[PDB]
């Protein structure tokens, strides 16, 4: 807290959807103590062995003969660190990995797979510390979430349908900050996915609701978008002090 | 930040500037100097630009488009095709080749835009380099009319012939390593 | 819009991206205040 540098304290863009922008302590700890967003989840950790076995089965020749070769072998498959080889086809590997994430065979919902098309690296991180959030999946310009899923969830009790079934169906997906860097998001389905003057026609995900970017204390603020930003921080601090 | 941009020059203000003044720091964050022009140069923009050029530090790197080192066995050989003409001209009445010539050639090529912006002259640059380094570096300069501004630098003629050194016949820093050191020194320390 | 301009007024209500960018600006202001206090206090003690 003693350090007066105003770099580590500022609200970074990558905090979107994973740390509350409004809720921070004021004083020596501005921007140094943060609070999770409402929908944020933190990875618990998993063994990387099944992912490595799948990669070995698909291709990912390790101990190759200087095959990168100006990255002719597109992408270098990384895991939690540990360059484990490279593949000639990166897009097929990425699509197969996403399908496996849906079928929940080798990839748990938390396993994060990032391909950097330029620089040609795939990172595949499962390291127990990543903070991720659920996002709906957009195929073409259509959300995968449909009336069947919503009707089943509406009957949630005595229908034995829950959020985990929504994840298993492949409707929703957990995305961490690294994957948030490689994903085109839409705030709302109707306003953005629908055909208009085409800003983007390659949306890959959709926010479940924007208001989830706020934390627990900032979520009680009514009409927070109509207030000045410091006032929402003040209300977070004061709502921690209310009597009830 | 939020300082009004009267001119394109940043200035420390507020608490940090008060700290600098109060501490009498030897290194200000933004040391600046306001210069007022005495004569008609204040009124006329071209003379003011001349003063600005005279007051602004310019290294050879700022005006150099690209530098290369070619091993040229003979001056007449002209390994680079382009220099074959002007080298010939300079070697129609060769000067300082009586001792010897260096087998290595530093063919610096200057950007015309930077040269004309700083209003530098090929004779000016050649004089600065040759005089500051001495007779050791011999420089051949192109005509400004030529499409490429080329400066051909060679190591000491007497040092190449080794009659002047006498002592022991042992290469010091070879010649190409010495030429690379010379190139770095010219790039960052010419102060044209 | 991409780089932070907020066209909506407070009465109209900020859109989500405008909301996040406004939060970034307010955070910068708060950090400035908190950092300012200590440096100014040290200067004042030295002068006195």
């Amino acid at each position: 807290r003693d350090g007066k540098l105003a770099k580590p304290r500022q609200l970074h863009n990558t905090l979107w959807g994973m740390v509350c922008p409004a809720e921070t302590p004021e004083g020596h700890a501005v921007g140094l103590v943060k609070n999770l967003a409402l929908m944020a989840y933190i990875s618990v950790g998993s063994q990387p062995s099944p992912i490595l076995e799948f990669l070995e089965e698909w291709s990912m020749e390790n101990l190759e003969e200087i095959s990168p070769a100006a990255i002719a072998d597109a992408t270098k498959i990384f895991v939690n660190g540990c360059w484990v080889g490279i593949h000639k086809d990166p897009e097929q590997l990425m699509n197969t990995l996403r399908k496996l994430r849906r079928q929940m065979d080798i990839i748990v919902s938390e396993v994060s797979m990032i391909r950097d098309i330029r620089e040609r690296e795939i990172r595949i991180y499962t390291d127990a510390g990543r903070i991720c959030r659920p996002l709906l999946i957009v195929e073409k310009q259509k959300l995968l979430l449909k009336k069947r899923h919503i009707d089943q969830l509406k009957e949630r009790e005595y229908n034995n349908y829950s959020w985990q079934d929504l994840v298993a169906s492949g409707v929703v997906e957990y995305i961490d900050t690294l994957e948030e860097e490689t994903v085109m998001l839409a705030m709302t389905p109707d306003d953005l996915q629908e055909k208009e003057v085409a800003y983007c026609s390659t949306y890959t995900h959709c926010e479940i609701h924007p208001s989830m970017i706020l934390g627990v204390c900032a979520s009680i603020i009514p009409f927070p978008d109509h207030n000045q930003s410091p006032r929402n921080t003040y209300q977070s601090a004061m709502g921690k002090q209310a009597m009830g | 930040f939020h300082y009004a941009g009267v001119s394109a020059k940043n200035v420390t203000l507020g608490v940090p500037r008060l700290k600098e003044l109060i501490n009498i720091s030897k290194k200000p964050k933004t040391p600046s100097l306001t210069v007022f022009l005495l004569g008609q140069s204040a009124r006329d923009a071209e003379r003011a630009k001349d003063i600005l050029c005279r007051l602004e530090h310019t290294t050879l790197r700022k005006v150099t488009a690209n530098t290369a080192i070619y091993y040229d066995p003979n001056p007449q050989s002209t390994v680079v095709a382009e220099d074959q003409e002007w080298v010939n001209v300079y070697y129609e009445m060769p000067d300082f080749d009586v001792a010897r010539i260096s087998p290595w050639l530093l063919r610096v090529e200057l950007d015309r835009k930077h040269m004309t912006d700083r209003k530098l002259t090929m004779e000016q640059i050649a004089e600065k380099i040759n005089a500051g380094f001495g007779d050791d570096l011999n420089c051949i300069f192109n005509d400004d009319n030529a499409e490429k501004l080329v400066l051909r630098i060679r190591i000491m003629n007497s040092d190449e012939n080794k009659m002047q050194e006498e002592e022991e016949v042992v290469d010091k820093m070879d010649d190409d390593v010495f030429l690379r050191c010379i190139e770095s020194n010219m790039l960052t320390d010419m102060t044209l | 819009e991409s780089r932070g301009f907020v066209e909506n007024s407070y009465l109209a209500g900020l859109t989500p991206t405008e909301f996040f960018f406004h939060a970034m600006g307010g955070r910068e202001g708060l950090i400035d205040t908190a950092v300012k206090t200590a440096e100014t206090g040290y200067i004042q003690r030295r002068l006195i």
């Binding site: - | 939020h2 | 600006g25 202001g29 400035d32």
Partner: peptide, 8 residues
């Protein structure tokens, strides 16, 4: 939060 010349 206003502009570049104002405040954040």
């Amino acid at each position: 939060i206003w502009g570049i010349g104002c405040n954040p």
